């Protein structure tokens, strides 16, 4: 039971707290954002070019 | 009001040593003064865990992520 079965491409790097990627594999979508201000919770598309940078070099 | 010497980064000690069974997810903070930082969230404890962000499994892992 994949918890996201929908992704937000409208998000930025600054409005994330930190991202969690779901031991999940199976699921096409497994990377949730917590979202700055408000703490929601919502899976984002996995092809945003931040992504590769924020997992950090 | 200052805000210094009172907000640590989420890691200050890291594990090299973790299970990708025993991992329900991987909870990835990245800030100017912390730089990148994992802190896996256990299956067999639920805790919370900074692990070595080296580990050659990571790699994979977050790159099967489809970023």
């Known amino acids: 039971r994949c918890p996201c079965r929908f992704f937000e491409s409208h998000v930025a790097r600054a409005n994330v ?3 969690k990627i779901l031991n999940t594999p199976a699921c096409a979508l497994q990377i949730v954002a917590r979202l700055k201000n408000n703490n929601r919770q919502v899976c984002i598309d996995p092809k ?4 590769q940078e924020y997992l950090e070099k």
Not at 48 to 51: A, C, D, R
Request: charged share 30%.
């Open 17 to 19: 707290k930190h991202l």
């Open 48 to 51: 945003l070019k931040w992504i």
